[PDB]
């Protein structure tokens, strides 16, 4: 995020993966210790997180992502983004906390909260 780009590419890739809805591709975006707060219950790990997110996006009419915060320091870009999934006029919201590391080029979702 130097001017004299990466956040936008991140968001667009994540939108592409959610629109496709492939649970395995979603799983590969998850930190191994992801925490997903789904209403009353909390689940952990890539497989449970991907199963939750794939379920919610497979039923959508429209999906969008709004960037809520970003912190860019020492090659690490931490982002909070709100995914909105409208179904039959009703909006389900999932907030993501995610980290992109410049050295390996990997995005990982660390936390999700449904909402």
Instruction: State the CB neighbour count (10 A cutoff) for residue 44.
Output: 12
Question: What is the C-alpha separation between 43 and 51, in angstroms, rounded?
Answer: 10
- Locus of tokens 């497989």: 47
Select from 60, 61, 43 the least CA-distant residue to 52: 43
| Element housing 59 (H / E) | none
- Locus of tokens 């709004």: 66
Tokens of 66: 């709004």
Question: What is the C-alpha separation between 21 and 39, in angstroms, rounded?
Answer: 21
Backbone angles phi, psi at 58, to 5 degrees: -70, -20
Query: Residue 60: helix, strand or coil by DSSP?
Result: coil
Tokens of 31: 């930190």
Instruction: State the CB neighbour count (10 A cutoff) for residue 75.
Output: 10
Tokens of 18: 């959610």
All structural domains of the chain with their residue ranges: 1-115
Question: What is the C-alpha separation between 97 and 79, in angstroms, rounded?
Answer: 6
Backbone angles phi, psi at 110, to 5 degrees: -95, -30
Resolution (A): 1.4
Question: What is the C-alpha separation between 108 and 88, in angstroms, rounded?
Answer: 30
| Element housing 62 (H / E) | strand 62-73
CB 14 within 8 A of CB 29: yes
């Amino acid at each position: 995020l130097y001017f004299q780009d990466t956040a936008r590419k991140i968001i667009k890739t994540l939108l592409d993966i959610m629109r496709e809805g492939d649970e395995d591709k979603l799983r590969d975006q998850m930190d191994p210790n992801v925490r997903a707060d789904v209403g009353d219950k909390t689940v952990h790990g890539r497989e449970h997180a991907a199963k939750f997110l794939a379920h919610i996006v497979k039923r959508a009419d429209h999906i969008s992502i709004t960037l809520k915060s970003l912190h860019n320091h020492n090659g690490r870009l931490r982002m909070q983004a709100e995914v909105r999934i409208v179904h039959n006029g009703r909006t389900e919201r999932v907030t993501l906390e995610m980290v992109f590391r410049d050295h390996n080029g990997k995005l990982l979702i660390e936390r999700m909260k449904y909402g």
